[PDB]
Amino acid sequence: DRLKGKVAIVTGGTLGIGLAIADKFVEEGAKVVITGRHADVGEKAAKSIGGTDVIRFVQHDASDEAGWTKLFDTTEEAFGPVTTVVNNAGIAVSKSVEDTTTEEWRKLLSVNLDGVFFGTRLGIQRMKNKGLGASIINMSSIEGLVGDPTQGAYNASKGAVRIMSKSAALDCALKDYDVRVNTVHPGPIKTPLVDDLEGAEEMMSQRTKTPMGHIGEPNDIAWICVYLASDESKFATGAEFVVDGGYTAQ
Amino acid sequence: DRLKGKVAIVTGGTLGIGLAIADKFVEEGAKVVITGRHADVGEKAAKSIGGTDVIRFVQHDASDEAGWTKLFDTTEEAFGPVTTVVNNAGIAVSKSVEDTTTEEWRKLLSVNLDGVFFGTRLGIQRMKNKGLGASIINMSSIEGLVGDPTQGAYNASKGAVRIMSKSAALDCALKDYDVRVNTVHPGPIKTPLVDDLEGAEEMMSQRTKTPMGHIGEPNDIAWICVYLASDESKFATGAEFVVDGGYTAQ
Amino acid sequence: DRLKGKVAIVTGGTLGIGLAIADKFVEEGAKVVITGRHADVGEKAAKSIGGTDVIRFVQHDASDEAGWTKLFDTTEEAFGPVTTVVNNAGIAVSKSVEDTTTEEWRKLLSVNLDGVFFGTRLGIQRMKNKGLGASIINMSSIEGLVGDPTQGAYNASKGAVRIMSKSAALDCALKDYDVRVNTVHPGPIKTPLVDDLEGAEEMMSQRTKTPMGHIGEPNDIAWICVYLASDESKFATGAEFVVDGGYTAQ
Amino acid sequence: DRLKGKVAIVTGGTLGIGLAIADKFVEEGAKVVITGRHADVGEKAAKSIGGTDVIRFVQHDASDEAGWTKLFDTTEEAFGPVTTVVNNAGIAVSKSVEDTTTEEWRKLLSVNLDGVFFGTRLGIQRMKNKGLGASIINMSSIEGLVGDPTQGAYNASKGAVRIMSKSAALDCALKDYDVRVNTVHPGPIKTPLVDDLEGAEEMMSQRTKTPMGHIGEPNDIAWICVYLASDESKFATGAEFVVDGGYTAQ
Ligand SMILES: NC(=O)c1ccc[n+]([C@@H]2O[C@H](COP(=O)([O-])OP(=O)(O)OC[C@H]3O[C@@H](n4cnc5c(N)ncnc54)[C@H](OP(=O)(O)O)[C@@H]3O)[C@@H](O)[C@H]2O)c1
Ligand SMILES: NC(=O)c1ccc[n+]([C@@H]2O[C@H](COP(=O)([O-])OP(=O)(O)OC[C@H]3O[C@@H](n4cnc5c(N)ncnc54)[C@H](OP(=O)(O)O)[C@@H]3O)[C@@H](O)[C@H]2O)c1
Ligand SMILES: NC(=O)c1ccc[n+]([C@@H]2O[C@H](COP(=O)([O-])OP(=O)(O)OC[C@H]3O[C@@H](n4cnc5c(N)ncnc54)[C@H](OP(=O)(O)O)[C@@H]3O)[C@@H](O)[C@H]2O)c1
Ligand SMILES: NC(=O)c1ccc[n+]([C@@H]2O[C@H](COP(=O)([O-])OP(=O)(O)OC[C@H]3O[C@@H](n4cnc5c(N)ncnc54)[C@H](OP(=O)(O)O)[C@@H]3O)[C@@H](O)[C@H]2O)c1
Ligand SMILES: [Mg+2]
Ligand SMILES: [Mg+2]
């Protein structure tokens, strides 16, 4: 239906937000390849959504540049030319800037920043000039808009994704590539990332944090991603789509 | 049926953006009342979308405070409790701040700002605490994000709507009203507002203005409004949804 | 003397932030006219900063359009051509959008928005093309950047000032008028406005409001205005200068 | 005068913007250490401003992590505890995201992002809790606010610096460290970086780029840095100070 004919790569599509994006993309008629590092999780995730006629898992670390090439090749062979890239894989580290080790800094940036760069660069290269209505959806966060004292490297990575995506959006638009680039900025969402940080859900559910008084769910981010992947959003590029319970409005 | 059961007021819904919002709202299952000041244009507009079982026209100037209560009463008599208010009526004045007459200032603000205040205030009063999944969508502009040297009063109006809507969203969220408030920021859209302005489409299509090299169409704004009116966006409030061909990304 | 030769109008210059702006403007060599509604308060304020050779009080309500041209005339007759206009007069209303009466809406906007419009429009007309290094400083707020659930009309006015100022800045720059226009966005500041609201300073001093754990002082806003009025800022126009204890960074 | 008793490190302080920051810092009474990679240029730069009692050059690549500790030790041995860190060193690469090689990407980020991280992290460690009125000034750019189609890696780096600085600002504020962190966002400035790229100043001077119709000068950025280093800005933290001729206001 709303994504008829689309062919999407969703990185980190085996749990949490990415899993829900994959789920709703398939529901709307897209063919999907989901990636993650853990093949046990990934093969189960794909089967939980559908058969191999509509979704497949590829084991791939988003920080692995060479694997990105193989990932597009595998997706093309399975489903035809890629039309949609969701750079969603990402990790956190609970450290202030002051307390961030250089190893933590480089590791987080290798996934959250390099991975989004590799996927955006290759997405442009693979999808430009093909009349596909192509769309690159880069997962930022409210932490790409406001700071947090205890996620210094994470803040750096999400602010970089925010503005790098604008550069790509502009170049694709000016060159008539038929590729749009936008960023999505979730507020707190119930995912393993949040579930595995003790007390995170309670802290983020305070009204001083999220005015709605609760955190979101992965489908809240899947539905804005369906909009940005569909041709309904053919005039949206370089823009920031914030789904955050009011977090950044105060 | 993405808007199953919704009951919407769309101000200025007889031409341009508002007409397309009303069109796509009816397509997705909403009952709609459109407003405008010209009864013959408006009755035809309504009938062009559907019968009185799904859409009706009400003559009402958005700057008319007393008429806002009658407009809600009329819509609820027709279709039941209002769930969705799109404050779309608006006008432009091609004057710099320096050259703006006080008459022009007050006239434009009485529509673009007073009207949005009236609809937002009454929408909250009439829709809160009824479990309706209510949504107030306030039409700002890229001109609520950046300035334009020849639309001073318009800039003032669109920046007011931008931040006033955040106040409403926060209060509704904190009080558990089940009412969301967001703003939409179109870039240039082919409408009578633009068509009646000699040279405007040619000017806005320059790559230094809109990187996509063309202006949008009314459905481009309709589809983001369908997203915001639907329960798909139940975690989006107090946020800005920009559909502008890249205008504000550079 | 960083404001050597400057001649400044500071509306609402008899108490609080405006008083300190006037005070530091005189310390830096400017001649200053302060305005306010109450003559006993205003004559005492002017005298508390200096003599009539450097500062004078003029009774003028910023919402009074007719009084604006007389205010420029009086200042120029006293001190020579006006070079600097600080649109600082403003009022607050502690009401949600839902709870705002139309009288309260119109009244607040008549001061906070009309007054800034009147001073900016006249300031451009009377200062352009005279080699004065002219500067218009419009007092917005953090409430021009984020919403507050019980400051609806105030939010509307401060967002309007934010974007209307950009329009003016751009027109002046493109026409080589030698007039810059910028906005200042104070966070909470200890002033009679804040002193009169019982509990406001305690509430705004919580870390979830102001991360520094205390509110600012009027000189905090005076010093950014000195920078903006001086030729040090000859390349700054259309920009937002935020002095807020970290309030909007989280 | 305005920087009495301050002790500043200015990275990349031997040319362009950084040289002028150093020049005005010394004029206002600060002791300054400027860094650069080229020793002959650097010693001449320092001598051009003053003697070793007020300014000294230290050869240091901002991307060199271990050298940062030596740089702080050298500065403190010369002038006493560092109070002020200006992370100004930075490089550009004229490539779209699509055309950026991974080595170009890594190289630019090692200076523009890692260097700002290293200086901010160590600055907090070395200046907190000492009553210095410490200030960390991180040089972003208008390219941290909007995208540029031919500056992909640069855009990423400047957006990272923008939001990473908010994290640090908040942490320092919440912990009462007496350390402030802010970002400066120059528009086009006549410097060797701009001079050495053929067609830079001509293109940036077009009204569609810079509404003032000309680019800035290094002193334009020096003076906002003076304000941010001084105690005049003791209530400013986590904020963005834009000096860009109106570039981002349209
Ligand atoms: N949850 C929130 O509140 C929130 C809010 C705003 C933004 N975000 C952003 O949304 C995205 C998804 O977050 P989430 O909360 O859904 O995370 P999550 O629950 O931890 O899920 C992460 C997914 O990414 C995969 N993954 C982890 N590291 C990877 C790597 N190097 N390469 C490829 N895949 C990898 C995981 O699979 P494997 O473990 O098998 O690799 C898993 O499929 C992230 O970019 C995050 O920054 C989240
Ligand atoms: N077109 C663009 O490029 C653009 C871009 C950004 C934002 N916007 C915003 O989008 C909204 C719609 O713009 P548009 O371009 O579709 O305008 P448009 O083509 O002029 O259509 C205006 C609609 O509003 C109605 N209307 C005008 N004044 C009214 C009033 N006082 N009370 C009630 N209805 C009124 C008109 O009908 P009657 O004349 O019969 O009353 C018509 O139905 C406006 O808020 C505008 O500021 C437009
Ligand atoms: N204090 C804060 O926390 C804060 C934060 C951000 C922004 N602001 C803004 O900064 C500005 C100054 O606020 P403040 O806190 O210093 O206020 P304040 O202490 O109440 O002082 C207001 C000044 O304005 C004058 N005034 C009031 N209404 C006026 C009118 N209609 N025409 C001319 N003068 C008028 C008052 O004199 P009379 O009463 O004698 O007329 C007084 O001199 C306002 O724009 C406010 O919105 C304040
Ligand atoms: N110029 C503009 O239009 C503009 C606009 C906005 C922002 N900015 C930003 O402002 C900052 C200064 O730019 P600019 O135009 O003054 O640059 P510039 O004219 O090229 O000067 C750069 C200075 O940094 C030094 N430098 C270069 N690489 C370095 C490294 N790895 N470690 C330490 N020092 C290094 C240079 O000396 P050596 O070569 O000897 O090391 C020189 O002293 C940069 O962060 C830039 O991104 C510039
Ligand atoms: Mg906030
Ligand atoms: Mg722009």
Query: What secondary structure does DSSP assign to chain B, as a single string?
Result: -TTTT-EEEETT-SSHHHHHHHHHHHHTT-EEEEEES-HHHHHHHHHHH--TTTEEEEE--TT-HHHHHHHHHHHHHHHSS--EEEE-------B-TTT--HHHHHHHHHHHTHHHHHHHHHHHHHHTTS---EEEEEE--GGGTS--TTBHHHHHHHHHHHHHHHHHHHHHHHTT-SEEEEEEEE--B-SHHHHTSTTHHHHHTSTTT-TTSS-B-HHHHHHHHHHHHSGGGTT--S-EEEESTTGGG-
Whole-angstrom Cα distance, residue A187 to residue A210?
Answer: 8
Whole-angstrom Cα distance, residue C144 to residue B163?
Answer: 7
The contacts of residue C132 (CB under 8 Å, 6+ apart) are C81, C83, C178
Q: What is the DSSP letter of C13?
A: -
Whole-angstrom Cα distance, residue C173 to residue C194?
Answer: 36
Give first-to-last CA distance, chain C, whole Å.
36
Whole-angstrom Cα distance, residue A233 to residue D122?
Answer: 44
Q: Where are the alpha helices (DSSP H) in D12-99?
A: 16-27, 39-49, 65-79
Helix axes C152-174, B152-174, angle to 10 degrees: 150
Q: Which amino acid is at D249?
A: A
Supply the range of the domain harboring residue A96: 1-250
Phi, psi of B90 (to 5 degrees): -175, 160
Q: How many CA atoms lie within 13 A of B30 on its CB side?
A: 34
Whole-angstrom Cα distance, residue A141 to residue A158?
Answer: 6
B58 CB near ligand 2 (under 6 Å): no
Burial level of D229, CB count in 10 A (0-12/13-18/19+)?
buried
Residues of D in contact with C236 (CB under 8 A): 220, 224, 242-244
Which numbered ligand comes closest to the C-alpha of A146? 5
The answer to whether C121 touches B104, Cβ cutoff 8 Å, is no
Task: State the residue for tokens 């002028």.
Answer: D20
Both tokens assigned to A162? 């925010």
The contacts of residue A31 (CB under 8 Å, 6+ apart) are A6, A7, A8, A54, A55, A78, A79, A80
Task: Say if B85 is an interface residue toward chain C (CB within 8 Å).
Answer: no
Q: Is the CB of B217 less than 8 angstroms away from the CB of A211?
A: no
Whole-angstrom Cα distance, residue C228 to residue C101?
Answer: 36
Q: Is the CB of D120 less than 8 angstroms away from the CB of A100?
A: no
Among D142, D148, D247, D250, most B C-beta atoms within 10 A, so best to mutate, is D250
CB atoms within 10 A of CB A18: 27
Q: Which amino acid is at A151?
A: Q
Whole-angstrom Cα distance, residue C110 to residue C107?
Answer: 5
Whole-angstrom Cα distance, residue D229 to residue D84?
Answer: 6
The contacts of residue D42 (CB under 8 Å, 6+ apart) are D14, D34, D35, D36, D57, D58, D59
**Which of residues 173 through 192 in chain D touch C, CB cutoff 8 A?**
173-174, 176, 187
Whole-angstrom Cα distance, residue C151 to residue C161?
Answer: 15
Whole-angstrom Cα distance, residue B245 to residue B247?
Answer: 6
Residue C71 backbone class (left: φ over 0; alpha: ψ -120 to 50; beta: rest): alpha
CA dihedral A123, A126, A131, A132 (to 10 degrees): -60
Domain count, chain D: 1
CA of A12 to the centre of ligand 1 (A): 6
Phi, psi of D8 (to 5 degrees): -115, 140
Element (H, E) at A235: none
Whole-angstrom Cα distance, residue C154 to residue C139?
Answer: 12
Bridge partners, residue C136, by sequence: C85, C181
Choose the closest CB to A97 out of D143, D145, D171.
D171
Phi, psi of A138 (to 5 degrees): -105, 125
Q: Whose CA is nearest to atom 2 of ligand 4?
A: D189
Measured from CB, residues less than 6 Å from any atom of ligand 3 are C 11-12, 14-18, 35-38, 41, 61-63, 88-91, 111, 139, 141, 186, 188-189, 191-194
Both tokens assigned to C130? 């005279």
Q: Whose CA is nearest to atom 46 of ligand 1?
A: A90
Q: How many CA atoms lie within 13 A of B201 on its CB side?
A: 13
Q: Is the CB of A236 less than 8 angstroms away from the CB of B243?
A: yes
Bridge partners, residue B57, by sequence: B34
Whole-angstrom Cα distance, residue B212 to residue B205?
Answer: 8
Whole-angstrom Cα distance, residue C27 to residue B117?
Answer: 43
Both tokens assigned to D116? 């700002």
**Which of residues 229 through 248 in chain B touch A, CB cutoff 8 A?**
232-246, 248
Whole-angstrom Cα distance, residue B31 to residue B13?
Answer: 13
The experimental method behind these coordinates is X-ray
Residues of A in contact with B249 (CB under 8 A): 166, 169-170, 237-239
CA dihedral C114, C116, C117, C123 (to 10 degrees): 140
Burial level of A74, CB count in 10 A (0-12/13-18/19+)?
middle
The answer to whether B8 touches B81, Cβ cutoff 8 Å, is no
As for chain C, the residues directly before each break of C–N over 2.5 Å are none
Which numbered ligand comes closest to the C-alpha of B211? 6
Bridge partners, residue B136, by sequence: B85, B181
Q: Identify which of D100, B213, B201, D101 has the alpha carbon closest to the alpha carbon of residue A178.
A: B213
Which residue of C10, C15, C24, C162 sits with most ligand 3 atoms within 8 Å of its CB, as the best mutation to test the pocket? C15
Residues of A in contact with C244 (CB under 8 A): none
Whole-angstrom Cα distance, residue B51 to residue B49?
Answer: 7
Both tokens assigned to A125? 């290269």
Bridge partners, residue C87, by sequence: C138
Element (H, E) at D85: strand D84-87
Bridge partners, residue A182, by sequence: A137
**Sign of CA pseudo-dihedral D48, D54, D59, D61:** negative
Residue positions forming the annotated binding site of A: 14-17, 37-38, 61-62, 88, 154, 158, 189-193, 250
Q: What is the DSSP letter of C111?
A: I
Strand, coil or helix: what is A243?
strand
Q: How many CA atoms lie within 13 A of B98 on its CB side?
A: 20
Q: How many angstroms away from the CA of D129 is the closest CA of chain B? A: 36
Q: How many CA atoms lie within 13 A of D208 on its CB side?
A: 12
The answer to whether B140 touches B240, Cβ cutoff 8 Å, is yes
Give first-to-last CA distance, chain B, whole Å.
37
Which numbered ligand comes closest to the C-alpha of C112? 3
Give the nearest chain B residue to A163 (CA atoms).
B249
CB atoms within 10 A of CB D59: 14
A144 CB near ligand 1 (under 6 Å): no
Counting atoms of ligand 4 from 1, which one is nearest the CA of D17? Answer: 16
Distance of CA B39 to the CA centre of its chain: 20
Counting atoms of ligand 2 from 1, which one is nearest the CA of B42? Answer: 40
CA dihedral C24, C27, C30, C36 (to 10 degrees): 50
Distance of CA B187 to the CA centre of its chain: 14
**Which of residues 119 through 178 in chain C touch B, CB cutoff 8 A?**
120-121, 124-125, 128, 143-153, 155-171, 174
Q: How far is CA A116 from CA A111, A128, A138, B50, D147, in A?
A: 8, 17, 7, 45, 16
Whole-angstrom Cα distance, residue D238 to residue D174?
Answer: 12
The answer to whether D19 touches D13, Cβ cutoff 8 Å, is yes
Whole-angstrom Cα distance, residue D222 to residue A67?
Answer: 46
CB atoms within 10 A of CB A193: 17
CA of C190 to the centre of ligand 3 (A): 12
Element (H, E) at C35: strand C31-36
Q: How many angstroms away from the CA of C43 is the closest CA of chain A? A: 39
Whole-angstrom Cα distance, residue B45 to residue B59?
Answer: 12
Q: How many helices (H) and strands (E) does chain D have?
A: 9, 7
Burial level of A54, CB count in 10 A (0-12/13-18/19+)?
middle
CB atoms within 10 A of CB C193: 17
How does B199-220 read in b/e, with b if 16+ C-beta sit within 10 Å? ebbeebeeeebbbbeebbebbb
Counting atoms of ligand 4 from 1, which one is nearest the CA of D111? Answer: 31
Residue C19 backbone class (left: φ over 0; alpha: ψ -120 to 50; beta: rest): alpha
Whole-angstrom Cα distance, residue C205 to residue C216?
Answer: 10
CA angle in degrees (0–180, nearest 5) for D238-D240-D241: 130
Bridge partners, residue D48, by sequence: none
Strand, coil or helix: what is A228?
helix
The answer to whether C97 touches B175, Cβ cutoff 8 Å, is no
Contacts 24+ apart (CB under 8 A), A105-110: A105/A153, A105/A156, A105/D114, A105/D117, A108/A153, A108/A154, A108/A157, A109/A153, A109/A156, A109/A157, A109/D109, A109/D113, A110/A63
Counting atoms of ligand 1 from 1, which one is nearest the CA of A61? Answer: 32
CA of D1 to the centre of ligand 1 (A): 51
Residues of D in contact with C211 (CB under 8 A): 169-170, 173-174, 237-238
Among A235, A237, A241, most B C-beta atoms within 10 A, so best to mutate, is A235
- Pairing type for strands A31-36 and A55-59 reads parallel
The answer to whether B210 touches B247, Cβ cutoff 8 Å, is yes
The contacts of residue D41 (CB under 8 Å, 6+ apart) are D14, D15
Both tokens assigned to C135? 């500067």
Q: How far is CA C129 from CA C3, C125, C172, C179, in A?
A: 19, 9, 10, 8
Q: Is the CB of C250 less than 8 angstroms away from the CB of A148?
A: yes
Both tokens assigned to A228? 């940005």
**Sign of CA pseudo-dihedral A36, A39, A42, A46:** positive
Whole-angstrom Cα distance, residue D20 to residue D34?
Answer: 11
The answer to whether A11 touches A88, Cβ cutoff 8 Å, is yes
Whole-angstrom Cα distance, residue A127 to residue A176?
Answer: 12
Q: Give the neighbor-by-neighbor strand order of the sheet with D179-186.
A: D55-59, D31-36, D7-10, D84-87, D134-139, D179-186, D240-243
CA dihedral D79, D80, D83, D88 (to 10 degrees): 40
Q: Where are the alpha helices (DSSP H) in chain A?
A: 16-27, 39-49, 65-79, 102-112, 114-127, 152-174, 192-195, 200-205, 218-229
Give first-to-last CA distance, chain A, whole Å.
37
Among D145, D163, D166, D171, most A C-beta atoms within 10 A, so best to mutate, is D163
Choose the closest CB to C208 out of A146, A208, A249.
A208
Resolution in A: 1.8
Choose the closest CB to C212 out of D173, D220, D239.
D173
Which partners does chain D have (≥3 C-beta pairs < 8 Å)? A, B, C
The answer to whether C241 touches C182, Cβ cutoff 8 Å, is yes
Length of chain C: 250
Task: State the residue for tokens 């205003």.
Answer: C42
Q: How many helices (H) and strands (E) does chain C have?
A: 9, 7
Element (H, E) at C54: none
Spell out the SS3 assignment of A146-195: CCCCCEHHHHHHHHHHHHHHHHHHHHHHHCCCCEEEEEEEECCECCHHHH
CB atoms within 10 A of CB D96: 21
Whole-angstrom Cα distance, residue A250 to residue D222?
Answer: 33
The answer to whether A35 touches A62, Cβ cutoff 8 Å, is yes
Both tokens assigned to A116? 């989004």
Element (H, E) at C243: strand C240-243
Counting atoms of ligand 2 from 1, which one is nearest the CA of B62? Answer: 32
Give the nearest chain B residue to D208 (CA atoms).
B208
Whole-angstrom Cα distance, residue D159 to residue A160?
Answer: 5
The contacts of residue D93 (CB under 8 Å, 6+ apart) are D100, D104, D107, D108, D151, D153, D154
Q: Which amino acid is at C202?
A: E
The answer to whether B169 touches C147, Cβ cutoff 8 Å, is yes
Phi, psi of A249 (to 5 degrees): -85, -15
The answer to whether B140 touches B183, Cβ cutoff 8 Å, is yes
Residues of B in contact with A213 (CB under 8 A): 173-174, 176
